[PDB]
Write a protein that binds this ligand. Structure first.
Ligand SMILES: C[C@H](CCC(=O)NCC(=O)O)[C@H]1CC[C@H]2[C@@H]3[C@H](O)C[C@@H]4C[C@H](O)CC[C@]4(C)[C@H]3CC[C@]12C
Ligand SMILES: C[C@H](CCC(=O)NCC(=O)O)[C@H]1CC[C@H]2[C@@H]3[C@H](O)C[C@@H]4C[C@H](O)CC[C@]4(C)[C@H]3CC[C@]12C
Ligand SMILES: [Mg+2]
Ligand SMILES: [Mg+2]
Ligand SMILES: [Mg+2]
Ligand SMILES: [Mg+2]
Ligand code: NA
Ligand code: NA
Lengths: 303, 111, 300, 109
């Protein structure tokens, strides 16, 4: 079967690096051209790269066996022994972390189901604070299956150890650089996105994260190369690659207007020919359609 | 509490200021440091001891651990206004360090 | 094109009624046989039913213009004027609520980005409490585009009005009954799942919700008829229906062992012949052929 | 605060108990009620007035609104041991009602 794409508008899609809707579609030459994102990375033949998961509910989340201890001056401290989010054992291998683990930096608020021994309460949802990166003094090693989080508390929360699923509540001091995967040491990583022909720039699917910011009210953008629906589409179909890249058209299904042509490289990113200096945003109610295979040197018409 | 310091401290440009971080006896043989910036646990370490009482001086920050009274003193010299912000008294340990937030204010000299 | 199914194990799928992974696969004759869920409802031909959305990030969420006021004795009160989660205007029509709105009852903790006027803070994430149903004294009308939530506070949180996206943090007193969609009046609803032939029971994809429980530590289960990946799969493919139902086989991808045979009815639910029985979640669903609605299955 | 009551009230089996919920003058011509159970805003309304001073009794519970002193009085009669739990003084309004939590304890005679 010839490679095709799901008939879904980006505005109805799921983001691949933060569990939120896709809100924007744009190119921006002023941003880093070859980001080393580890989630939202898939090959057109279906191979998942980095820590990319299948389901959008795995994105920027983790699962663990949790052990709780109270330390005066810090609060309730959680030691998370990581597990793959479906329950199967996590073994350090050719990826940076368990599938879906956050691939950005900053201080992340996470939510977990906690059980207490305090009389009159049993099940509650506790917000924890967890530093991600870029460098920490907390010795985070998700590659080895262990991370530390804490909640500021004057007395012990009296929590019972057990299994948890952690979901992200907010990001503080966001930086789009890979987190501390292995206490400062190196890990296997999906390569930087690229290369691009001269004049080609990355197409960005953008969402905005819940954030903590003491001084700035502007929304915090985060980009991914492909929406999560495209990731599971390629992973489920397992197409055969018949050339070097795919020529795509982004067109309004109602009006028929062709908005642009772009190139979907085999390695899982989309390029547009754009010479402008500033960011150019696109409507999100179009549809991507595969036109044909093209060589990597195929020259696109500029946006 | 493992480590305590001044919640707010003020100095003047081209002058100096001193910060005292008091700790409990159990942290004597641990490394002590002076951190800068937020998020807390991604701060840039400006100066750090080697768990001894020997004085350590970096570019403008000094640290000396008094292991009899359990106080390590941080000194910032030749202050500039860009030095204002959030700082931390730190004790190096595996995992989450004991830390104390210090807000530093810098102003000019009255003229 | 003949109908096919995505090659994904259930344990790797997204739940369709609460934003969490699928953890369980089971049938249970002791549960209500014909649930009237409004999310996770799709026709095999691609038609979305009820409030079912395309993306799993819309499930049990909403979007709104928020207006905040402090009321002594209650706290900070939020009036949410609902909008479809992509920003397009919500118009009361043939569905119970904006797409993806929760279709269960209880007290829901929600999280929204809030902006404050207090010095030293600007952007924060505030947890609100929002009663869903089954009946409330809060006059919730998501069908009409307005719901109310509150934060218990002794003084105002000093929040700025604006647009928000609300995501579910926990459920309190969960009940699998449709919420108060219209201040007690009735709304257009997807019909109850069914019917089933004698001996046929609903196949349930199960996850467990983050919960607030003062006395019981057991997990809070919630079922859906189809995983979210199946919903968007049918919605994007828009297959042609050639009969009444499709016969499916659920087999171990490694061993090849057939675990059970089932029927996927055109209306979007799976039935098995059973007289609670849980199944492994690492199998694959494979379409065998179209079958008549009266096709009798082999019992599990 | 719009409505205040007793934090805890106790009665005896087959007996009665009385709860006084005081409110501010603005809420005079609103309906008052006595609610039972949690979650708070999905509780079962046991009895409710019609915004008059007329006594209304349903579900073993009676209520009388004093609109001169701005206090409505709730009485629970023929108490059972199962009557213990969480209750609310309520004022019916559009949206979120003013409510006050009252804990009820029951014992033998
Ligand atoms: C107490 C929680 C349920 C509440 C919860 O946090 N739900 C997640 C959500 O609402 O998004 C339980 C229910 C099922 C549990 C998971 C499943 O049992 C599968 C798996 C089993 C592993 O031993 C531990 C991780 C992992 C993944 C478990 C983590 C804790 C979960 C998620
Ligand atoms: C302040 C937030 C960003 C932070 C946030 O809440 N992100 C959601 C998450 O992290 O899951 C802003 C950024 C983009 C906004 C959305 C988009 O502008 C689209 C849409 C526009 C409508 O006028 C209001 C709803 C809706 C859907 C907006 C709700 C508020 C959003 C989501
Ligand atoms: Mg380290
Ligand atoms: Mg910001
Ligand atoms: Mg009503
Ligand atoms: Mg429960
Ligand atoms: Na450390
Ligand atoms: Na009301």
């Amino acid at each position: 079967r010839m490679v095709d794409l799901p008939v879904i508008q980006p505005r109805l899609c799921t983001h691949a690096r933060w569990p939120a809707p896709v809100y924007g579609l744009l190119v921006d030459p002023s941003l880093p051209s070859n980001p080393q994102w580890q989630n939202g990375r898939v090959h057109v033949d279906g191979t998942l790269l980095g820590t990319t998961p299948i389901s959008g509910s795995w994105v920027s989340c983790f699962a663990a066996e949790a052990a709780y201890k109270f330390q005066s001056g810090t609060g309730e401290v959680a030691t998370f022994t990581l597990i793959e989010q479906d329950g199967s054992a996590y073994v350090p291998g050719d990826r940076a972390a368990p599938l879906g683990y956050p691939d950005f930096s900053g201080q992340l608020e996470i939510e977990v189901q906690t059980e207490t021994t305090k009389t009159g309460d049993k099940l509650k949802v506790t917000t924890f604070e967890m530093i991600l990166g870029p460098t920490t003094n907390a010795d985070q090693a998700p590659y080895q299956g262990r991370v530390f989080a804490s909640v500021t508390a004057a007395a012990s929360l009296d929590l019972v150890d057990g299994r948890v699923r952690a979901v992200p509540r907010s990001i503080y001091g966001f930086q789009d650089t890979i987190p501390e995967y292995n206490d400062g040491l190196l890990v296997p990583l999906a390569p930087p996105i690229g290369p691009f022909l001269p004049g080609e720039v990355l197409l960005r699917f953008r969402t905005y994260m819940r954030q903590i910011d003491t001084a700035d009210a502007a929304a915090e953008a985060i980009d991914c190369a492909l929406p999560q629906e495209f990731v599971s589409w390629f992973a489920s179909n397992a197409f055969t690659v018949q050339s070097e890249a795919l020529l795509l058209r982004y067109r309004n299904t109602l009006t028929g207007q062709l908005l642009f042509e772009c190139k979907l490289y085999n390695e899982g990113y989309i390029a547009l020919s754009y010479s402008g200096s500033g960011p150019l945003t696109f409507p999100t109610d179009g549809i991507f359609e595969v036109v044909s295979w093209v060589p990597r040197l195929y020259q696109l018409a500029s946006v | 509490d493992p480590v305590t310091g001044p919640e707010e401290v003020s100095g003047q440009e081209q002058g100096s200021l001193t910060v005292q971080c008091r700790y409990t006896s159990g942290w004597k043989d641990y490394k002590k440091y002076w951190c800068q910036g937020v998020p807390q646990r991604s701060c840039k370490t400006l100066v750090e001891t080697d768990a001894s009482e020997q004085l350590v001086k970096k570019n403008r920050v000094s640290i000396r651990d008094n292991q009899r009274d359990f106080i390590f003193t941080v000194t910032m010299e030749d202050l500039r206004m860009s030095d204002a912000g959030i700082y931390w008294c730190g004790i190096t340990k595996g995992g989450l360090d004991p830390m104390f937030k210090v807000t530093v204010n810098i102003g000019p000299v009255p003229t």
